Structures are given as C-alpha cells and as structure tokens.
Write a protein that binds this DNA or RNA. Structure first.
Ligand SMILES: [Zn+2]
Ligand SMILES: [Zn+2]
Lengths: 208, 24, 219, 98, 56, 49, 56, 194, 119
RNA sequence: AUCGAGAGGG
DNA sequence: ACGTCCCTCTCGA
C-alpha cells in the first residue's frame, strides 16, 4: 500500500481546482462535481490512471450572452509524466477534426519543446501543470476578484473614462490569474477589492 | 618626529659621491 | 627605510566547505595567474612534495590540516624540480630575480636567505588554515594597534626622498657645480603649502598640510 | 588624547644580536620535527629565529628596557596561548604610559 | 536618594543574580538550547532581557 | 589580583579639547562630543602677542 | 578592556553602566557609553543621506 | 496552520519538521573511507543478515536525530534510493550503540570520494529545500466568538528563514489560503501582480 | 589518517589495491617505491569538528596574567589554584562550558555536567 | 574673477 | 549606477 497515497491526494486536489477554474472561466460545472471527495474519486477513478479523468464541460447560458463565441473546450490529460510531440499530435487532432474552440492540456511532470500549440488558428491552447494546480492561487487572502470584460464591455470603459488602450493599468499574459482565465492581449479585467478607504475600490487592468 | 627626522633619518638618504650633510 | 614598495602578496585557499577543490595558490609581484604554493616552494629550493609539509606544519599531528594540503600537492605535482618550477613562472631564469628581489623583501632580497623566505611562506599558509578550521578568529582590520600613523617626520621623509628623487636624475643630465637647487626647496614648499602632499603636480592624499587654528588657545 | 605619544623609529640590529646571544636558533638550521615547542621570534614582522623556554627570555628583556639598555618605545609581547613573540622597533606606534 | 534610591540599589543587585544564575549554569551546558538560536546566542538574548528589564 | 600594571589617572583618556568639560562623568556621551568641538568655536585670549 | 578578566562575559564589563548620571560613571562605564552614541552620531551625520536619496 | 485544530501545538510540530529542510550534512558527525573486502570490529554483528571492497562509513549523532528527530531506517532509505540499485547500502538500528551506514560501489579510489560530498550536501532528508530553518510561536489573533462578539483565540504559525512558497503552498495541513512571505517579489510571481 | 611518504623521495603516497592478494599498498608516483598499509583508514572528513577545542595549552599556561584563576578543585592533586578558559575553537555555536587548567598538575578537565570532557 | 583642495554652521 | 537639502568663512595656479 506504500505511501503512493500521498501522491494519490496531490492530483485529486489538483483535479478539483483544475475543474474549479472551468466554472469561473465560463463553463458548466456544479459545486458537488468539484466537491466530489477522493473516496468517491478513487471508487469511480481507480490504480490512479489519468486518461480516464479527461472531461469536456461547455458554456453556461449566462456566459453565452456577453461571450457568445466562447465555444467547445476539450481537456485531455496525459499519463506519462514527460510528453513529446508524438502524443501532442494525438491531442491536437481531438480539437482539430472536431473543430472546437479552446483546450487546456494538463501535464503532470514535464514537457519539452517538441512548440506546436500555436498552429491551429483559430484556437490557442492553455497548458497547465499539476505541481502548481494542486493549490489554487485564487482562494488566497490577497488575490482580488479579476472579472473578464467582453469586447463591448471594453469599448465601454474606453469611452466612458476617455482612454486610449495605452492609458489603462496592465496585467501580463503570464499573470497567475490571467492564465487562470487565459487572458489574451486586448482582453481587460475588473479587479474588484475591499479597500480600507473606499471600502470597495474597483481597479482595471488590460493584458498583453 | 621632526628632530629624529632632521638629525638622523635625513642623512640616510645619500645613496660625485655624497657624504655627511649639514643644515643651517 | 628606503622606499614605498606597493607590491603586496596574495595567498588564498580556493574552494569552500564541501568543495574538495581546496587548492592553495598565491599571487606574487609581477606575475599574473596565481602560483600553486607548491610550485613556488620548488623555485625556492624545497623540492620533495612532503619535504615542504614540515615548513607548513609545526606539529606533524594536525591530520585535518594536512588533509587539505593534499590537492595543492597534486595541483603542483606536474612540476617536480627547481628548474621546472620557475619556467612555469614565464633566459626565462628571470623568475629567480623576481623571487629574490620584489618578494617577501622585508627579510632581505639577497639571494642566500632562501630558507627564511620559505619558513615564512609556510608561516603564512599556516595562519591561513587555523581560520579555515575555526581554531582562529580572523583578524580585526579595525584593530588599532595594527594601525600606524606617520607624523611630520615620515611625511617629510616620503616627500624629501621622492623629491631628491628626480634631483639625481637631473644631475645625470649635467653631462650630455651647476645642478638644480630650486626643486628641493620649491618642492618642500609646494606640499607643505598645498596640503596635496606634493607628488610633482599631480593630485594626492590631498588635505594633509592644514593651516593652524587660532580662535582660542585650546583649539 | 593627552598622555598618548608616538613611536619614532629605533634600530633593530642591536637586539636581533642580543637574541643570538640569549637563546635564538636561526631558521636555516631549523626543522620542527625535533622541536615543536619551538616558540618564534618577530621583530617588525621578520621571523629571525626560535627559542624554547621564553620565561626568563621575555622577562630578562622586560627589565632590559626598564633599566634603559633597550629603548623604551619599542614594544615587547609574547603570546603564550600561541607561542609567538613579536617585537616592534616600528615607527608609528601609539604608546601610553603605565 | 530617599529609601527610593535605597531600594533601587537592590534591583540593580537582584537582577545580577537573575544573570548570575544563567552564568555558570550556561557553562555547565545545562542551558536549554532554545528552539533555533545557538547556546551562545540564547545566553545573550536571555540576559539582555534580564538587563533591559533591569534598567527599566 | 593578577595585576601587571596600574592606570595613572583614568582622566587621561580624554582629548586635547574635551579635557575641559566640567564632569563629563555625569553627561550623555553625544553631548560631550559637542562641547568638545564647540570650545573650538569660541572667543578668548588666543595668544598674548 | 585591558583592565578585565579574559574570556569574560560579565555585565559589569560588557557595557552595563549601573551608575546613573546623578552619580557618575566610572572610566569603564564612561567609555562604553561613548562607543554606543558614536554609531549614534554616525547614524545622524553619515547615514542621514540614506533617506535623502530615497526621497529624490 | 489549518482551520480546525490550528490551536494544536503538535499539528505544527510536524509541519515544523515536514519542511524545515534536513540533509545528510545535517547529522553526519564524521565520514571515513576504508579498503576492506568486513574487517571493522563492531560492524561484525551488523553485517550478519560482486560489489567493490571500497568502504564508505559515515557516522550520525545521537542528538542530531532528536532536534530534527530523524529515523535511521529512513535516512539511508533515500541514500539507497538516490542511486537506484547502483549502491549496496545498509545501516544499523535506532536502538544501537553507534549509528553508522556502510556503502559499496557495486580504479575507483577518488571515484567513491566522489559521492563523499555528493551524499553530504545534495542529499536532503526530511523537508522542502531553501527553508534552512523554521520556528513555530504563538501570537493572539482576534476572531468572532459565535455569541456574536470578537474574541481572543490564539494559534500557532511556522515562521521560516527561507522562501520557496512555489511548493510550500501545496503542503497539507497548513492554510494555503493564508500563508504569507515578505518577498513581495515572490508573492508577485506566485499569486498575481494585484 | 596520519599517513606518510616514501623513504627514497620523501614524496607523499597515493593508495593502491593488491588486485591478486587482496591487500592495500601505499604507492608512490615519483619513484616506484611501495609499502603495505598500516590501517584501512584512508580518508576521514569529520564534519562536527572537535580537534583543538582546547587547542594550544603548553608550558607556562597558568602564567598569561590575562586569564584569572578559579577556586575549584583538580581531579588528582585538587588545587584550588588553577587557571581556566572557554573553548579556544572559535565557532559560532560551541557552548560556553569552561575547560579549566590546573596551575599545579597541568591537566585539563571540564565542568560540563551533561557529559564529561577528556580534552 | 574661474576651477581645485581644505575647516565649520544648522 | 548614482550616491540628503542650504549656508558662512579661509586659500593655492
Ligand atoms: Zn618515493
Ligand atoms: Zn592537579
């Protein structure tokens, strides 16, 4: 029975938070679904093998109003800790032949260059890791609620506050959270936070 | 410092051949 | 007692705790790289790689001390005799001059003393190690007894010597009494009169001849 | 401060001989593998030789200046705990009276 | 200098005891190497708490 | 009582100027460092010629 | 202090000035006061330009 | 700590010693080398229950395995595992007279002196690295007593002397949602500009 | 290790193994001298240093006015006349126990009560 | 006047 | 890479 069970915990937590991010990003997940403990996880998923836990959630009916082009997102996992282009061509075609919108591929230990992610216009694919997915950064005391702004919720800040894109504070594409919502360049955000003064300041950041 | 300079350690610096030296 | 000599002597234990590369080398007047404590011992004359270990160690029972003097021996194993040694300092004999002369010269730079130049060099690599093996507190560079201070005397000394300086090579020009007399005077004048302790007219520990205070006796 | 003075410069020879004449083995005829309790001599940063029992060496000296045969500015100091003996005819030393 | 300075003279005394104890006690190794700091450093940082609170 | 020597009067550690402070053994150490180079900015009989 | 035991960690010579200003330090106590304020005097004339830079 | 029993001195006591970074160099009190194809007098009983005759016998310290309180059957277990089956190793027991490990290479005079040091500094035992030292202490923290008011219920917290949150985030039984590090520059990389 | 050098070269000696008889020899690489090891203890690291924790304490050691004297007792002659001093191994950790030294019989002995030091 | 060095005043 | 703000004197090419 060894102490693989400590490696058994450190991917179910990751799972829950990996799935957590899909609800916030604008997909269909229930809190029960993410709350599924390891006891029910192992029972339904064991022995721990990852190609079994691949999911495909889709857009909500609220997300399709302001984001009506955010289509089908496929998420397949890998069993081999290291991954090469061979396996990556097997995963890219899943979204390639079915013509889906986005894809988040989790690797649990390492991937080298063999560099093909950005060659499916129109679909850029996020690539996370179980080492940093295990504990969610967004639940932190000091991580404010960033909220995605639309293409019409953007051109509405840029007129009201009399800006040119330049003039807006900034978040970077690799920002822990931007990745956690996969922010593209020209996407904005409404970082809302408690303040000791206003009581509820409402900054804004764009993303490059 | 000056005395011990003048008296001795000044002479030491004589190395057409220079010898004992006097200052007024 | 005759110069200033700015040639200072470096001797450093490479490799920190947990490195087994702890080679001891030295950097010496007019020689770029650093020379294995061993090589320099041979060009001295102390030749057997072990013959030397009694110059370093004043009790051949400091086993832990000796265990570090190990790499250096192999570091400078590649050279074995005296000749071989100072060609690695490069007809090329010139190295014997440089050791004899601009090196550990507060001893004498007559050749014949080749055994207190070594029995010293050891005494240095000795004291270095006591600190490596925390049987010593590294010295106190802010320790006053170790500081000297020149007063007027020495201060004229440097000026008068460095003055009479190009007096005698100006008299070497009275051939190719009627020598120069002003330069010793107007020299001494200058510095005691600028505070920029002379040095021809390039400035230099400026602010050393200060005019006396007179607002009260005490001051 | 007030009672501080400063060293002038004395000569070293007439004491590096007063050592040869009271217990000093020069080092060209020194190897420690017969004498480890060899205590060491130092005059102004020069290791001239070696002596065995410093007891009446550093104490025949310390009453040598006391009467005046050696100059009173030069400083004499032996370090029992490390078996070393440094003497300074230096010029620059800041002696106090005691 | 009333009995006040007469009693301020003992706190300057009793607080040498509160550091006279930890004296040969620390040089009998009995000094509890506190969580982290050395034995040496525990002796300072526990005596200065006995001198500062002494002065105060 | 391992005493090699004895100090002449402690008061001689004082400096050329500060030597003139009335009871510095009752004053805060930074003040004494001022009276020190303050009697150097004074008025008085600097010589007699 | 060349007036004190070697390898010694006392307070009466690691800097604890028991006497008061009213009373009057001894040359020991007096000396250590000195060392302390100097760095104090160094803090004010020397390192006063640390935050003058920060400000520009 | 974690929400529930963070008033539990002991619960930290293992998060203390579950990251406080211990290595071989930590306990080894001496590391000797020997030519012996089992000479050593007192090792005879130990050897009871193809290689190379080059010995490597590093000895640990009684108090060393108490402050960090390591296990003799685990300290060598990672040495055993670090070099796969390329090193014939077996230790003693925790109730022994003197704790010692013996390893064989399975010319190699200095080639084993190779894993002289390699074992010492680059072989970590019980903890996550960079956190060179740790210390848990109590500090009061106000929180609401159900009755409605705020109260004075303290708790423990493990203060570090190094910073790699990148994965002291994910340890179990802390409060990842609360952990704090002065390195506002690491906090920037881990948790977001904002 | 306390090892030695050749007798022909006075150069140090790098170990080697009797690949037929199973024995250890102390080679030489200057000359071709050899000899068979005394003990099998080739290398030692010793990380927790303890050599010289009383380093330097020879002839006139109750002399250095510096160090006062104790009124304690010696484990043989029992002289309340005896000097003292802290560990002269200057590390940041080593404890403040004091290795006394007797003026009268010149033999070391701690007051360390947890253990009991020999040197 | 200009540059260079020097002691004090907060 | 620059290295707190201002102010009063005094002196050598
Ligand atoms: Zn040989
Ligand atoms: Zn005795």
């Amino acid at each position: 029975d060894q102490e693989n069970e400590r490696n058994i915990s450190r991917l179910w937590r990751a799972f829950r938070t990996v799935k957590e991010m899909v609800k916030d990003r604008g997909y269909f997940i229930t809190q029960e679904e993410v709350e599924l403990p390891l006891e029910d996880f192992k029972a339904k998923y064991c022995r721990p093998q990852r190609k079994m836990m691949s999911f495909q959630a889709n857009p909500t009916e609220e997300s399709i109003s302001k984001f009506p082009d955010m289509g089908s997102l496929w998420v397949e996992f890998c069993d081999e800790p290291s991954v090469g282009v061979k396996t990556m061509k097997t995963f890219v075609i899943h979204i390639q032949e079915k013509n889906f919108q986005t894809g988040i591929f989790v690797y649990q230990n390492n991937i080298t260059p063999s560099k093909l992610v950005p060659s499916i216009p129109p679909a850029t694919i996020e690539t996370f890791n179980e080492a940093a997915l295990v504990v969610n950064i967004t639940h932190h005391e000091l991580v404010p609620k960033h909220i995605r702004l639309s293409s019409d919720e953007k051109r509405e800040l840029l007129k009201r506050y009399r800006l040119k894109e330049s003039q807006l504070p900034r978040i970077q594409r690799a920002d822990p959270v931007a990745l956690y919502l996969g922010l593209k360049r020209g996407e904005v955000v409404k970082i809302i936070r408690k303040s000791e003064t206003s009581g509820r300041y409402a900054s804004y950041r764009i993303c490059m | 410092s000056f005395n011990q300079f003048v008296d001795y350690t000044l002479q030491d610096i004589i190395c057409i051949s220079f010898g004992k030296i006097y200052v007024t | 007692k005759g110069s200033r000599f700015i040639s200072t002597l470096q001797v450093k234990l490479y490799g920190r705790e947990g490195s087994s590369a702890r080679t001891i080398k030295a950097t010496l007047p007019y020689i770029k790289q650093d020379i294995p404590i061993v090589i320099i011992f041979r060009a001295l004359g102390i030749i057997p790689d072990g013959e030397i270990l009694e110059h370093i160690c004043y009790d051949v029972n400091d086993w832990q001390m000796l265990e570090m003097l190990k790499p250096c021996v192999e570091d400078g194993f590649v050279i074995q005799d005296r000749e071989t040694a100072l060609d690695f300092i490069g007809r090329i004999q010139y190295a014997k001059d440089i050791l004899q002369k601009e090196f550990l010269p507060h001893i004498t730079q007559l050749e014949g003393f080749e055994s207190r130049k070594a029995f010293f060099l050891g005494y240095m690599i000795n004291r270095l190690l006591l600190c490596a093996l925390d049987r010593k507190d590294q010295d106190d560079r802010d320790h006053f007894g170790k500081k000297r201070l020149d007063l007027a005397g020495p201060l004229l000394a440097q000026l008068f010597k460095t003055l009479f300086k190009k007096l005698t090579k100006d008299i070497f020009r009275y051939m190719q009494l009627a020598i120069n007399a002003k330069t010793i005077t107007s020299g001494l004048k200058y510095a005691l009169a600028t505070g920029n302790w002379g040095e021809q007219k390039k400035a230099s520990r400026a602010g050393v001849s200060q005019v006396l205070n007179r607002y009260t006796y005490s001051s | 401060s007030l009672m501080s003075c400063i060293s002038v410069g004395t000569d070293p020879m007439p004491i590096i001989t007063f050592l040869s004449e009271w217990g000093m083995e020069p080092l060209e005829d020194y190897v420690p593998h017969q004498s480890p309790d060899a205590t060491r001599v130092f005059v102004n940063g020069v290791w001239h030789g070696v002596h065995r029992n410093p007891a009446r060496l550093m104490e025949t000296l310390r009453t040598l200046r006391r009467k005046g045969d050696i100059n009173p500015e030069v400083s004499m100091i032996r370090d029992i705990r490390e078996k070393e003996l440094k003497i300074f005819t230096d010029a620059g030393r800041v002696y106090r009276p005691l | 200098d009333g009995p006040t300075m007469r009693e301020i003279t003992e706190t300057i005394a009793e607080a040498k005891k509160k550091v006279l104890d930890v004296t040969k006690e620390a040089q009998a190794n009995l000094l509890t190497a506190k969580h982290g700091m050395t034995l040496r450093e525990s002796f300072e940082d526990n005596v200065v708490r006995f001198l500062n609170e002494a002065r105060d | 009582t391992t005493f090699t020597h004895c100090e002449i009067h402690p008061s001689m550690i004082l400096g050329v100027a500060a030597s003139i402070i009335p009871f510095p053994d009752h004053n805060q150490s930074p003040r004494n460092t001022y009276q020190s180079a303050m009697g150097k900015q004074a008025m008085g009989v600097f010589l007699t010629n | 202090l060349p007036h004190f035991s070697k390898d010694d960690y006392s307070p009466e010579s690691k800097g604890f000035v028991e006497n008061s200003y009213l009373r009057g330090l001894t040359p020991q106590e007096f000396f250590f006061h000195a060392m302390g304020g100097r760095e104090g005097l160094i803090d004010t004339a020397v390192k006063t330009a640390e935050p003058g830079y920060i400000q520009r | 700590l974690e929400p529930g029993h963070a008033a539990d001195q002991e619960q930290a006591k293992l998060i203390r010693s579950a990251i406080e970074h211990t290595t071989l160099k930590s306990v080894t009190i001496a590391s000797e080398i020997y030519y012996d194809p089992t000479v050593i007098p007192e090792d005879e009983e130990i050897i009871q229950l193809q290689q190379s005759p080059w010995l490597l016998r590093l000895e640990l310290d009684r108090a060393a395995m108490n402050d960090k309180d390591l296990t003799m059957g685990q300290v060598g277990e990672r040495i055993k595992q670090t070099f796969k089956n390329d090193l014939f190793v077996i230790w003693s027991e925790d109730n022994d007279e003197k704790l010692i490990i013996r390893c064989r290479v399975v010319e190699e005079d200095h080639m084993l002196k190779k894993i002289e040091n390699t074992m010492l500094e680059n072989i970590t035992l019980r903890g996550v690295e960079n956190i060179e030292r740790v210390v848990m202490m109590k500090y009061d923290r106000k929180v609401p007593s159900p009755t409605g008011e705020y109260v004075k219920e303290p708790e423990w917290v493990l203060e570090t002397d190094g910073v790699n949150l990148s994965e002291v985030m994910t340890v179990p039984g802390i409060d990842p949602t609360r952990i704090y590090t002065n390195s506002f520059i690491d906090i920037m990389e881990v948790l977001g500009i904002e | 290790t306390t090892f030695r050098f050749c007798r022909d070269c006075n150069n140090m000696l790098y170990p080697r193994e009797d690949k037929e008889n199973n024995r250890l020899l102390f080679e030489c690489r200057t000359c071709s001298y050899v000899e068979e090891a005394g003990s099998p203890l080739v290398y030692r690291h010793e990380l927790i240093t303890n050599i010289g924790e009383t380093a330097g304490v020879v002839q006139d050691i109750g002399s250095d006015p510096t160090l006062p004297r104790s009124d304690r007792e010696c484990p043989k002659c029992h002289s309340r006349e005896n000097v003292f001093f802290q560990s002269q191994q200057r590390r940041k950790d080593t404890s403040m126990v004091l290795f006394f030294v007797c003026l009268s019989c010149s033999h070391i002995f701690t007051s360390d009560q947890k253990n009991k030091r020999t040197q």
